[PDB]
């Protein structure tokens, strides 16, 4: 899915000029591009970025003639983004004083695409355009540009310094030409490819989410010996983790190779007599007993599993399986085997039959002939479009515990007063995180935490960027917008006030 994408920049005077209440359109272009390149560089993807300017005092580009394609400079060709380019954008670039034609600059970008992507591979192409539209431009070529964009599969996004909703007549005319060309490529969906820089900052202020391609696990689901169904499974929920670790280096040279780890062996007894690795053997505890056991014997005697399985032990009521028992560190969704009409019919039948009877299936799972087998539940899930089983691991008898906690309800000391219960009843309403009666008698969630990105990665990447751009300064504090996104809505915060005073006044609390 490689995308070749070109940032195309008006470097004239009109976007260089600033309304004093706001940073210049040049500055906003700098910021939004800065967020973009930060995202791409801290992303694992290998997509490459090229940056071109139009309106430059100079004139240098692949198409450029003596008079044609004037005031256009290819500031950056297509390579992987890096901190050098980042600093170039941060400080090197300066406002210009000339004007050029953006529909020349995008065919300069076509030439860049043609000549720089032919040695490479790309599923998609995108051009990103920044300007105020204050300059006279021609439309003579509009057919052959739209044809070029169609035939080479080039997508467009136009970024306007103002909300879509004081613009000059040229400005509004250009707006409508932007409508007409983006209609000519993409219709009404085309008309939605316009964004204000304010909402752009709101949208890409955050560092990008992590993702992976879960490997499909093909298998035969078995009922008894004779009934079998072909299936495929995917990991769906996991405790996701950054793969790049810290590396340890010499404080003076910053090299890795200057340091070495050594493992000592010595007897447990006094004066710590040193031992050669050769005369060490492997053994195990068994209560007060210690049993010697070689790794070869341990491997040869270890339990051997048959290999891949997904076999059903039987069915029970869903109410047998309280979800507090759910074990394991993964969640699988199981679909039918790829492109098997009969298999899809079969698994549809199973999900249907199970959901109708309000029952669940108990299954035995084994990833491969090396892994340890597991016992787990599977249960039906139904949506628009697809149906699937969900699967989760269940406990073995050896991994439960029990604790005999004192019953609070029958206690004479800790029974609350009716007045206390009324203050609690006020409080639990005030802290409600959901809105009822949306005319569909449905809950709206005011704090849907499944959509919030993990803040540990946000903090890590922010600190890394700060150190890279500024080695001398210490680490910056956490970001206020991060805090705001981690706190609940201010309406709930304000409504909490009086019930909290009431409950503090009612309940006596004191420390040991």
């Amino acid at each position: 899915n490689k995308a070749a994408v070109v940032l195309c920049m008006d470097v004239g005077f009109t976007m260089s000029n600033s309304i004093p209440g706001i940073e210049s359109p040049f500055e906003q272009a700098k910021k939004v591009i800065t967020m973009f390149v930060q995202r791409q560089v801290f992303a694992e993807n290998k997509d490459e970025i090229a940056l071109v300017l139009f309106g430059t005092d100079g004139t240098d580009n692949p198409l450029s003639g003596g008079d044609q394609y004037q005031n256009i400079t290819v500031h950056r060709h297509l390579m992987l983004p890096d901190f050098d380019l980042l600093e170039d954008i941060e400080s090197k670039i300066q406002p210009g004083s000339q004007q050029a034609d953006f529909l020349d600059a995008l065919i300069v970008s076509m030439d860049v695409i043609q000549h720089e992507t032919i040695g490479k591979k790309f599923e998609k192409r995108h051009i990103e355009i920044f300007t105020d539209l204050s300059s006279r431009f021609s439309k003579s070529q509009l057919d052959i540009i739209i044809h070029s964009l169609k035939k080479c599969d080039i997508s467009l996004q136009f970024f306007l310094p103002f909300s879509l909703g004081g613009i000059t007549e040229q400005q509004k005319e250009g707006l409508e030409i932007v409508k007409m060309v983006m209609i000519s490529l993409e219709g009404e969906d085309g008309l939605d490819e316009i964004y204000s820089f304010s909402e752009s900052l709101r949208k890409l202020c955050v560092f990008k989410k992590i993702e992976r391609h879960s490997i499909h696990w093909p298998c035969r689901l078995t009922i008894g010996s004779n009934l079998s169904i072909r299936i495929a499974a995917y990991k769906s929920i996991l405790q996701e983790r950054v793969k790049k670790t810290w590396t340890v280096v010499d404080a003076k040279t910053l090299k890795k190779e200057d340091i070495q780890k050594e493992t000592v062996y010595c007897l447990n007894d006094d004066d710590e007599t040193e031992v050669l690795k050769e005369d060490i053997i492997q053994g195990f505890r068994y209560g007060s007993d210690i049993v010697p056991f070689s790794k070869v014997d341990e491997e040869q005697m270890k339990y051997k599993s048959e290999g891949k399985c997904f076999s059903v032990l039987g069915f029970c009521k869903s109410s047998q399986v309280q979800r507090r028992f759910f074990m394991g560190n993964q969640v699988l969704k199981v679909f039918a085997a790829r492109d098997d009409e009969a298999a899809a019919v079969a698994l549809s039948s199973l999900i249907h039959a199970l959901d109708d009877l309000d029952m669940v299936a108990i299954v035995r799972y084994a990833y491969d002939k090396r892994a340890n087998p597991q016992v787990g539940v599977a249960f039906p899930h139904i949506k628009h479009n697809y149906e699937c089983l969900v699967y989760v691991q269940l406990p073995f008898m050896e991994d439960l515990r029990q604790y005999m906690f004192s019953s609070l309800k029958n206690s004479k000391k800790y029974a609350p007063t009716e007045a206390q219960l009324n203050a609690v009843d006020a409080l639990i309403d005030s802290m409600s995180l959901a809105k009822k009666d949306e005319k569909t008698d449905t809950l709206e969630d005011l704090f849907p935490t499944t959509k919030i990105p993990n803040p540990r990665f946000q903090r890590l990447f922010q600190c890394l960027l700060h150190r890279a751009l500024h080695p001398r300064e210490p680490l910056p504090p956490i970001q206020q917008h991060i805090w705001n996104m981690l706190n609940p809505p201010a309406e709930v915060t304000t409504k909490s006030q009086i019930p909290l005073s009431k409950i503090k006044t009612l309940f006596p609390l004191i420390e040991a």
Partner: peptide, 13 residues
Amino acid sequence: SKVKRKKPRGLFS
């Protein structure tokens, strides 16, 4: 309504 137009594009994804 089962598939939603909100999905980000290009620069946004």
